[PDB]
């Protein structure tokens, strides 16, 4: 029971700070590349 | 080596400039570099460094540590609250009772006749400490004196000129 | 002659000398 | 007091306003729509897809 | 006293989105209700899905904090406004800036769109607002008269058409065509950073650390106070059912009843794992278009979504 | 109304940040009615920022909490902005996009500060969560090393005697090496001027020098402070350490003496290989030529399989433990020199105005750091090979072997590890398995890390530089053998000493 | 609500003397070090 500084858990994880039922999304880089219009035009 | 005049300049210099401008201070001193000034401050002249006798608890903790962490005097020293040179000397001394670097040593006192340079430094240190003011701004102050002479000279000469009977207009 | 001086040149003396070197306050703008 | 100076960036540009067309989302449709039910619909769909995720 | 307030159910947090790299300072919902858009102090504009909470797209044009976004109901345009003194028009069929409005002399703090004509109004720290022509980028009016940064602006179709609150603690009601202040309201003692207009009642409310106040159009006649929230109030947001959300700057959020002014809930959310507790703060809140969800943009780089609680009743949560 | 371009990004950020702060509390959470001093809270804001940058814990004696929370919030805002800009510019510099010469220097300074902040935190966590190496890993390490050194009949190095014959040769070599820096005789500075002075006066009078040197090695255990700075190589940085002259001379002589004696008593077995006998291209040739000269190496009839693994110890310079290192040095040298060497790694490291104390890792800018790195790596070679196979490879101490040779063929084939090379901290191993040894390894691998879904083929990294006809062909037996071999080697190393 | 003044260690804009004390003001050791070191001596 020594925690190499490689671990050193600060910072209680999200489920422990928010609750058992609150959902939690973490969204780094996006789907849907930039060329894809948000509002598509008509044809 | 370190001379009481110099480290008494250093106390005042640190008191004035702050604890992070070592090159300024080093410039106050002849024959010192900023590294040596900083070393002397952090080894001897800091007011938070204790030069007292070792309480019995101090000595027991010192030997305790010197066994837990051997030769790591920079690690040990703050754990007990004295500088590593003190801890090292006193630990070897304890071991022998039971058996350079000039920053650490005290300061050779002042002589009866202070060598000329020892004196001019003090005057110039007094010079530097006294003057809070900048250069540009001081030039403006001297110019302000110069300018009142100007207006003052002009007026009397203007008074006298128009008194001589010629009503000059500058424009 | 190098030989231990009498009193010392402790810092407060320097700070007091510099504070008394008080010439940068200067003379007042002359009343006329 | 109007100047005759001028700018490279004040030339005419994008001189027609696009209006939101019939299918994109015109104020008529959004005036109509029922939003709460549509939202709960897509919400349930997304939860379905992500339980299929696992 | 009062008649007694209507019972509204209370709200519960159910989602926490976190993908921004600086405070989130503005939030808005599309007309058609499919996605919302956030602008942050990491100089991006992210566009998220409102059902799933997934991030669709990230637009990066600004040079500093994006302090306001809005989506136009008549045209496929998103108008953003930053601290780089620049105001942008993004066309959402190519996802690219097509128009930029130049002339403010310091950071732009907020912006609103006129609902019938095509103009923009922006407020900035040079203590002016400007009425821009959407189509020719020309500033048709500089509403001047405040004596300190203009914290917020809202515009409407009825009259008066522009309400600005500023940091000199004053509100002004302006006329759009003439371009000058009709009324000046000096009841607040501290900066007015929040203004909101009731959707269906010709009244409005204005928030300040002293207390929220209600006023009645078109010449702003005082109506009542709403007190209890002693905090720098960054937002106000009103539902169509008379729920009024007051989001503060230390994180705490009160929910009130609009008509009687009765504070029926107080939410004190928690900070994201790696955050300090001095970094809890709400910068923007926005109701969904169905007025069912309440999204908030916070100073710990998260977006928190609240939904109404469906399993509570007047006797479970009585009205004091 | 001029735009905000590229030269006004920082000045404008600070304009708007302190306008925001002045709006924020100092006029909207007051009731310091008289004169709310906002011009002085802004001074606190700037000083909190400098204290962040210097890694100083900032705490002002009596300062209302709302203000302190406001300041902490805004310093976190500016810190996020600052380091995100550092990340962005570093990627541009690495891939090659900007040549601007103020961004290169601004960015080297930013990342130096970020490294030293992480580093002071890592030393504090060492001294708080205590030695990461348990007392049973450390004792196994100590006892294995004693068994090695005893079986070799090593002969510990003594303190350099009074009338040593070679003291002047070792000193001339040290001083020539130290001169080699300022070959240019450039614009140097005061401090290099002072070093050249010391070197010349020791080149003239070589016995006051050596008397000083041995006095140091005997009595000194608390040294001055080291400087650090970074050398920017555009795809990573290199730390460069700056030691003071008197000690540089003592260390240079100690370095020469240790390497000379170690080479005479044969400390380092022939596989520790930045060696003086061949340049690296000759190592590559001898390795290729040794693989090929193994016995029956290219034959595949009975289903044998050759595996070539190469790795890195992944940070050995950084998890050395100075207590354990002291004890491991004492087995090799005099306790006086061991104490000097390990008391010398524990110094104060200083950048512009950040200072901390080394307590955990190793300073590589010392002059004997080669010896420490290669000896510690020797201990880890022993942990990886085992004492028996290390004694087969190194041959008997009366008749040592060459780089990649064995005594006869009998011993050479008695074990899967046929060849082993270790550059400073880099590891190359060559195994030859029979089908049963290979199948056994794969079984024990799959037992503990079961992959029923056949994604072992995915994580495998190949060399996308030869054409596919020449890359590696991923059959499940093969990639499973690869993972099994690697899993088996990375299990011999405690994760508190080094990893892979 | 009174705000202390700042005395910085970097900026001394007006060149003012402040005594060392007021200039100045503005460690843990685990218990497994003992078990490690003594196991090594034994």
Tab-separated table of C-alpha atoms in Angstrom, chain E residues 190-191 193-194 207-212 226-236 246-254 256 268 280-282, chain F residues 24-25 28-29:
chain	number	residue	atom	x	y	z
E	190	UNK	CA	-25.090	48.000	-7.787
E	191	UNK	CA	-24.285	47.087	-11.370
E	193	UNK	CA	-25.771	42.672	-15.171
E	194	UNK	CA	-29.001	40.903	-15.955
E	207	UNK	CA	-31.147	41.706	-11.489
E	208	UNK	CA	-28.489	43.118	-9.216
E	209	UNK	CA	-26.702	42.051	-6.036
E	210	UNK	CA	-29.186	44.168	-4.028
E	211	UNK	CA	-32.306	42.426	-5.260
E	212	UNK	CA	-34.145	41.624	-8.439
E	226	UNK	CA	-37.560	39.911	-5.265
E	227	UNK	CA	-35.076	39.634	-2.438
E	228	UNK	CA	-33.078	36.888	-0.833
E	229	UNK	CA	-30.433	36.222	-3.459
E	230	UNK	CA	-27.490	38.178	-2.084
E	231	UNK	CA	-24.894	37.474	-4.724
E	232	UNK	CA	-23.546	38.962	-7.907
E	233	UNK	CA	-26.299	37.910	-10.283
E	234	UNK	CA	-25.098	37.083	-13.768
E	235	UNK	CA	-28.334	35.883	-15.397
E	236	UNK	CA	-32.087	35.952	-15.260
E	246	UNK	CA	-31.711	33.682	-10.970
E	247	UNK	CA	-28.152	32.463	-11.431
E	248	UNK	CA	-25.467	33.985	-9.290
E	249	UNK	CA	-21.743	34.228	-9.520
E	250	UNK	CA	-20.828	32.082	-6.535
E	251	UNK	CA	-22.614	29.134	-8.068
E	252	UNK	CA	-25.885	29.328	-6.205
E	253	UNK	CA	-29.072	29.408	-8.258
E	254	UNK	CA	-32.481	30.393	-7.015
E	256	UNK	CA	-38.610	31.936	-8.097
E	268	UNK	CA	-26.278	24.837	-4.788
E	280	UNK	CA	-18.116	27.786	-8.717
E	281	UNK	CA	-20.100	30.291	-10.665
E	282	UNK	CA	-22.899	30.513	-13.186
F	24	UNK	CA	-16.130	42.180	-10.412
F	25	UNK	CA	-15.855	42.517	-6.682
F	28	UNK	CA	-19.943	44.670	-6.672
F	29	UNK	CA	-18.910	42.869	-3.496
